[PDB]
Amino acid sequence: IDLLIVEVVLFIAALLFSGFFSSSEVALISITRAKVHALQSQGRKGAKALDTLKRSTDAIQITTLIGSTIANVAVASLATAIGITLYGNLGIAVGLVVAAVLVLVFGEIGPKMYASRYTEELALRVSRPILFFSKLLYPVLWVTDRIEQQFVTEPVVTEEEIKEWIDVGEEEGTIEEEERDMLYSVLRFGDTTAREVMTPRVDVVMIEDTATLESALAIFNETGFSRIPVYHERIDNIVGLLNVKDVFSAQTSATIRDLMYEPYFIPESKKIDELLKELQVKKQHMAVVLDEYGSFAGIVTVEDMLEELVLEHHHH
Amino acid sequence: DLLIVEVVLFIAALLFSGFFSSSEVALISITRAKVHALQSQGRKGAKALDTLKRSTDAIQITTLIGSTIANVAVASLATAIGITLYGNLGIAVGLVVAAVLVLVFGEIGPKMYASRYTEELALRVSRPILFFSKLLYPVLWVTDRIEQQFAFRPGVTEPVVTEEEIKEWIDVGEEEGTIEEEERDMLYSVLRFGDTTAREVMTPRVDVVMIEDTATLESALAIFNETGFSRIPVYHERIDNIVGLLNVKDVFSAQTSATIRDLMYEPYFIPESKKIDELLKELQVKKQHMAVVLDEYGSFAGIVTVEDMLEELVLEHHHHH
Ligand SMILES: CCCCCCCCCCCO[C@@H]1O[C@H](CO)[C@@H](O[C@H]2O[C@H](CO)[C@@H](O)[C@H](O)[C@H]2O)[C@H](O)[C@H]1O
Ligand SMILES: CCCCCCCCCCCO[C@@H]1O[C@H](CO)[C@@H](O[C@H]2O[C@H](CO)[C@@H](O)[C@H](O)[C@H]2O)[C@H](O)[C@H]1O
Ligand SMILES: CCCCCCCCCCCO[C@@H]1O[C@H](CO)[C@@H](O[C@H]2O[C@H](CO)[C@@H](O)[C@H](O)[C@H]2O)[C@H](O)[C@H]1O
Ligand SMILES: Nc1ncnc2c1ncn2[C@@H]1O[C@H](COP(=O)(O)OP(=O)(O)OP(=O)(O)O)[C@@H](O)[C@H]1O
Ligand SMILES: Nc1ncnc2c1ncn2[C@@H]1O[C@H](COP(=O)(O)OP(=O)(O)OP(=O)(O)O)[C@@H](O)[C@H]1O
Ligand SMILES: [Mg+2]
Ligand SMILES: [Mg+2]
Ligand SMILES: [Mg+2]
C-alpha cells in the first residue's frame, strides 16, 4: 500500500508521456516544410524550433519512438508490478491486460487521433519539448544516424488520400463522375499560368484598326471565330477586341474602332484560376496576354479555362 | 517453475512485436507499381497484398495493435520475471531491460530490416497481417465512424462518404500545407456546384426570347440585333413545343435561298432536376452552348447556357472551416 501509491502516479505520468510523444509525432511530421518556412518568416512562437526538427525528419521519428517506447514499457512494467502485489501471480496477466488496453487507447491511438484534428496548433506547441528530448537522445541519434553510412513517414492526410476519398464518392454516387474529374482538375489547376494555355500570336487571327467594317466579316465568317483582337499598325500593338455580334448589328457608318472595346491585358504569368473569375466578373470572354516587354503574345478565352477543369481524369 | 512460463512468453511476444513493426514498413514501403507487377506475375502472397494495400490505414492499426500488445507483454513479463528474482528491483530491471529489447528488436530493428527487404517480406507477411486485419474488423468499424479523427479511417467497412466527409478531409489538408489555401476554396466551390440543378440556374420560360420557325431571316436578324443574344430557341405553333435552336453566326452567313428550319439544329432537352455538373460536361462535349429545360410534362420551362452555369460555379462559391 505504501509503495503502491507511488507506483500509480508513475503509471499515469508515463501514460501521459507516451501520449505526448505519440501525439507530437503526428503533428510534427505533417506540416509541409513549405509551410514551416512560412510560419518561421512570420516569426510565430514555435516555428523556429519546428524548422530545426524538419532539418532532419529522422530526428522526429527516433525521439518520439524512444520517448514513447520507454514510456509504454514503463506503463506496463509497473501495471504488472502493481497487479501482482494486488493479485499475487494472477497480476502479471491482469496487470498486463489492463495495461495493453490503456497503452492502446491513451498512449497510441487516442493521442494520434486527437493530433490530427489540431495538427498546426499542436505542432507549434510540442516543438520546444520534442527538440529538447532529441538533444538528450543525441547519443542514440548519432548511433542510428551513423549507421546511415551502411545503407520517411507521410502526413495523416495526403493530397492522394483526399483524391481517393473522392473516387469513393464517384463509386458511391454521392459525387457525380463528372465532378470527380473537376475536383481532380482543381488540384492540378491553381499553379497553372495563362501562358501555358494561351493561343500563340502566330496562330491568332486579328485585324488592323484601319480595315473596313465589311471586311471584318470576311474574317469572322471565314475563320468562324466570334472575337478577334484588333491591332494598330503593329501586330505587337493590340488596341481592342472586336465582337462579331457588334458587326452584324452595326450601323451603316461605323468603323472598326467604333465597335471594338478595351481589352483586359494580362501577363504570361497570370494564374488561370483567378482569371476565370476576373472574366466572369467583367462579363467578358477574351483576355489579351503580353510578354515581359509589353508586346502581344496571345489571347485566352473562357472556353480555354473551361476545357482545363472539365478534362477527364484517370481512375485508380 | 512459473518463471519458465514467463521467459518463454517473453521471447514469443518479442517476435510478434518485431513481426508487426517490420510488416508495417514492408507493406507500406512497397510501391504501387511493384504490387501491380507481382500481381500480373502472380507470385505467392501478391493477390492478398494488392487487397491489403487498398486501405493503408488498416495496415497501421493492425500492426500497431499487434506490436503494441506484444510490446506490453514483453514488458509485463520482464517486470514480473525480474520481480520474481529481484523483488521490487525487478520492476526496474524489467522496465530497463524490456525498454531496450523492444526498441532494438521490436521497433528499430524490424523497421530497418524491412526497408532493405520490402519485396520479399511483404509477400510473406501479407497473408498473416491480412488475416489479423479481418479479425480487427470490429475495431475497423468503430474507427470508420469516428469522423472527428483522420489518423485511422480504413474505409473498408462501407462508410457513407458524402460531400460532408470530403470537406472534413480538405479542411485538414489546408491546415498542414498539403493543399494550398486558395485551391481549397475551389474544392468547396465545385463541391457545392454539383448540388445545383438546372432549374436553380436556368432562365424561366417567361424571360426567354424565341422565334417561330415560319418567320423569315429578315425577321430573325432583327431579333438578334434587338435582344443582343447570339442564340434563340424555336417552336412550332405552340410555346410549350421547342423544336430547335437558331444561331446568329449562321443566319448572318446564310445563303440567298435559306430558311430558319434548315438553319436550326436539334436541341438538347433536359429535365428541371438535371445536375449542371453533368450538363456542363455534356454541353462542353457536344460543342453546344445552350440546353433546353423541360418540366415533368415535357413542356418548355427554361434554358441553361454554359455561362449560366459558370456564374453559379464562380461568383457564388463556398468556403468554410
Ligand atoms: C499532456 C501530456 C503531458 C505529458 C508531459 C509533457 C512533458 C513536456 C516536457 C517539458 C520539456 O521542457 C523543455 O525544457 C527545455 C529546457 O529548459 C526548454 O528548452 C530550453 O533550452 C534552451 C537551452 O537548451 C534554453 O535556453 C531555453 O530556455 C529553452 O529553449 C523547453 O522550452 C521546454 O519545453
Ligand atoms: C538503445 C541503446 C542505443 C545506444 C545508446 C547510445 C550510445 C551512444 C554511443 C555513441 C556516442 O555518441 C556520440 O559519438 C560521437 C563520436 O564521434 C561524438 O561526436 C564526436 O564525433 C562527431 C563526428 O563523428 C563530431 O561531429 C563531434 O564534434 C564529436 O564530439 C558525440 O559527442 C557522442 O555523443
Ligand atoms: C479507439 C477504437 C476502439 C475500438 C473499439 C472496438 C469495439 C468492438 C465492439 C463493437 C463492434 O461493433 C459492431 O461490429 C459489427 C461488424 O462486425 C457492426 O456491423 C454489423 O452491424 C451493422 C448494423 O449495425 C450491419 O450493417 C453490419 O452488416 C454488421 O456487420 C455492428 O454494427 C457493430 O455494432
Ligand atoms: N481571334 C482568335 N484568333 C485565334 N484564336 C482564337 C480567337 N478567338 C478564339 N480563339 C481560340 O479558340 C479557342 C476557343 O475559344 P472560343 O470557343 O471562346 O471561340 P468562339 O467560338 O468565338 O466562342 P463563342 O462562340 O462562345 O463566342 C480559344 O482557345 C482561342 O485560342
Ligand atoms: N434567347 C435567350 N433568352 C433568354 N435568355 C437567354 C437567351 N440566350 C441566352 N440567355 C441567357 O443570357 C445569359 C448569358 O448566356 P450567353 O452568354 O450564352 O448568351 P450570349 O452572350 O448572347 O452568347 P455569347 O456570349 O457566346 O455570344 C444566360 O443567363 C442565358 O440564360
Ligand atoms: Mg466557342
Ligand atoms: Mg514491435
Ligand atoms: Mg455571353
Residues facing residue B203 across a β-bridge: B303
- Residue A17 beta carbon below 6 angstroms from any ligand 1 atom: yes
Of B94, B165, B176, the CB nearest to A157: B176
> In chain B, count of helices (H) and strands (E)?
14, 7
Within this chain, do residues A7 and A123 fall inside the same structural domain, yes or no?
yes
A153 and A29 Cβ atoms separated by less than 8 Å: yes
Within this chain, do residues A42 and A111 fall inside the same structural domain, yes or no?
yes
Within this chain, do residues B119 and B188 fall inside the same structural domain, yes or no?
no
Classify A261 as helix, strand or coil: strand
Cα distance between residue B281 and residue B285, in whole Å: 6
Within this chain, do residues A119 and A170 fall inside the same structural domain, yes or no?
no
Of B90, B148, B163, the CB nearest to A117: B148
Angle at A190 between CA B171 and CA A287, to 5 degrees: 140
Residues by chain with Cβ below 5 Å of ion ligand 6 = A 303
User: What is the CB neighbour count within 10 angstroms for residue B130?
Assistant: 18
Residues in chain B: 321
Q: Is the dihedral of CA B3, B8, B13, B18 positive or negative?
A: positive
CB contact under 8 Å between B76 and A95, yes or no, is yes
A219 and B212 Cβ atoms separated by less than 8 Å: no
DSSP per-residue codes, A204-234: ---EETTS-HHHHHHHHHHH--SEEEEESSS
Whether A315 maps to a domain, the answer reads: no
DSSP per-residue codes, B55-107: -HHHHHHHHHHHHHHHHHHHHHHHHHHHHHHHTTHHHHHHHHHHHHHIIIIII
A244 and B249 Cβ atoms separated by less than 8 Å: yes
Cα distance between residue A140 and residue A59, in whole Å: 10
CB contact under 8 Å between A77 and B65, yes or no, is no
Cα distance between residue A93 and residue A87, in whole Å: 10
Closest residue to atom 5 of ligand 5, CA basis: B208
Within this chain, do residues B288 and B184 fall inside the same structural domain, yes or no?
no
Classify B219 as helix, strand or coil: helix
Whether B280 maps to a domain, the answer reads: yes
Q: Is the dihedral of CA B230, B231, B236, B240 positive or negative?
A: negative
- Best residue of B178, B191, B249, B288 to probe chain A, by most A CBs closer than 10 Å: B178
Cα distance between residue B69 and residue A187, in whole Å: 40
User: What is the CB neighbour count within 10 angstroms for residue A258?
Assistant: 11
Q: Is the dihedral of CA A149, A150, A154, A159 positive or negative?
A: positive
CB contact under 8 Å between B310 and A159, yes or no, is no
Owner of C-alpha cell 448572318: B252
Residues facing residue A301 across a β-bridge: A286
Q: In the sheet that B269-271 helps form, which strands lie side by side, from edge to edge? A: B203-204, B300-305, B290-294, B269-271
A267: domain range?
194-310
- The amino acid present at B142, given as its one-letter code, is V
Which helix (H) or strand (E) covers residue B25, if one does? Answer: helix B2-29
Rounded to a whole number of angstroms, the distance from the CA of A171 to the nearest CA of chain B is: 10
Residues by chain with Cβ below 5 Å of ion ligand 7 = B 17, 21, 67, 106-107
Owner of C-alpha cell 459558370: B310
In sequence order, which residues have a C-beta less than 8 Å from that of residue A217 and are 6 or more positions away? Answer: A244, A247, A248, B252
Within this chain, do residues B275 and B306 fall inside the same structural domain, yes or no?
yes
Number of domains in chain A: 3
Cα distance between residue A74 and residue B120, in whole Å: 34
CB contact under 8 Å between B151 and A26, yes or no, is yes
- Residue A70 beta carbon below 6 angstroms from any ligand 1 atom: no
Q: Torsion angle, CA of A209/A210/A215/A219, rounded to 10 degrees? A: -40
Classify B214 as helix, strand or coil: coil
Classify B305 as helix, strand or coil: strand
DSSP per-residue codes, B122-173: HHHHHHHHHHHHHHTHHHHHHHTT-TT--SS----S-----HHHHHHHHHHH
Whether A31 maps to a domain, the answer reads: yes
Whether A6 maps to a domain, the answer reads: yes
* Among the listed residues B241, B36, B32, B230, the one whose alpha carbon sits nearest the alpha carbon of residue A248: B230
Cα distance between residue B232 and residue B219, in whole Å: 13
For the domain that residue A292 is a member of, what is the CATH number? 3.10.580.10
Within this chain, do residues B134 and B188 fall inside the same structural domain, yes or no?
no
Whether B110 maps to a domain, the answer reads: yes
In sequence order, which residues have a C-beta less than 8 Å from that of residue A111 and are 6 or more positions away? Answer: A18, A19, A20, A22, A23, A26
Distance between start and end Cα atoms, chain A: 60
- Residue B142 beta carbon below 6 angstroms from any ligand 3 atom: yes
Within this chain, do residues B175 and B235 fall inside the same structural domain, yes or no?
no
Whether B214 maps to a domain, the answer reads: yes
Which helix (H) or strand (E) covers residue A105, if one does? Answer: none
- Residue A238 beta carbon below 6 angstroms from any ligand 4 atom: no
Closest residue to atom 25 of ligand 4, CA basis: A226
Q: Is the dihedral of CA A191, B168, B140, B11 positive or negative?
A: positive
Cα distance between residue B265 and residue B242, in whole Å: 11
Cα distance between residue A288 and residue A266, in whole Å: 6
Compute φ and ψ for A228, nearest 5 degrees. -125, 135
β-pairing, A199-200 with A296-301? antiparallel
β-pairing, B269-271 with B290-294? parallel
Which of B193, B215, B233 is a domain's end point? B193
* Among the listed residues A273, A226, A14, the one whose alpha carbon sits nearest the alpha carbon of residue B314: A273
* Among the listed residues A213, A159, A207, the one whose alpha carbon sits nearest the alpha carbon of residue A187: A159
Which chain B residues are closer than 8 Å to A81 by Cβ? Answer: 79, 83, 88, 90-91
CB contact under 8 Å between B165 and A162, yes or no, is no
DSSP state of A194: G
Q: Torsion angle, CA of A197/A200/A205/A209, rounded to 10 degrees? A: 110
Angle at A299 between CA A293 and CA A301, to 5 degrees: 145
A272 and A186 Cβ atoms separated by less than 8 Å: no
Of B98, B194, B284, the CB nearest to A179: B194
Classify B234 as helix, strand or coil: strand
* Among the listed residues B108, B28, B152, the one whose alpha carbon sits nearest the alpha carbon of residue A112: B152
Measured in Å, residue B229 CA sits from the centre of ligand 5 at: 6
Which chain B residues are closer than 8 Å to A175 by Cβ? Answer: 163, 166, 194
In sequence order, which residues have a C-beta less than 8 Å from that of residue B228 and are 6 or more positions away? Answer: A245, A249
- The amino acid present at B99, given as its one-letter code, is A
Q: Rg for chain A (alpha carbons), in Å?
A: 32
Q: Rg for chain B (alpha carbons), in Å?
A: 33
- Residue A289 beta carbon below 6 angstroms from any ligand 4 atom: no
Within this chain, do residues B170 and B126 fall inside the same structural domain, yes or no?
no
Owner of C-alpha cell 495563362: A194
Within this chain, do residues B189 and B207 fall inside the same structural domain, yes or no?
no
Whether B158 maps to a domain, the answer reads: no
Per the structure block, which three cell numbers stand in for B26? 514492408
Quick one: closest CA in A to B247, which residue?
Answer: A245
Quick one: closest CA in B to A72, which residue?
Answer: B72
Break-preceding residues in chain B (C–N over 2.5 Å): none
* Among the listed residues B78, B100, B74, the one whose alpha carbon sits nearest the alpha carbon of residue B19: B74
CB contact under 8 Å between B75 and A76, yes or no, is yes
Per the structure block, which three cell numbers stand in for B238? 405552340
Within this chain, do residues A132 and A20 fall inside the same structural domain, yes or no?
yes
Cα distance between residue B94 and residue B232, in whole Å: 86
Whether B207 maps to a domain, the answer reads: yes
B103 and A69 Cβ atoms separated by less than 8 Å: yes
Within this chain, do residues B170 and B135 fall inside the same structural domain, yes or no?
no
Rounded to a whole number of angstroms, the distance from the CA of A295 to the nearest CA of chain B is: 30
Cα distance between residue B101 and residue B105, in whole Å: 6
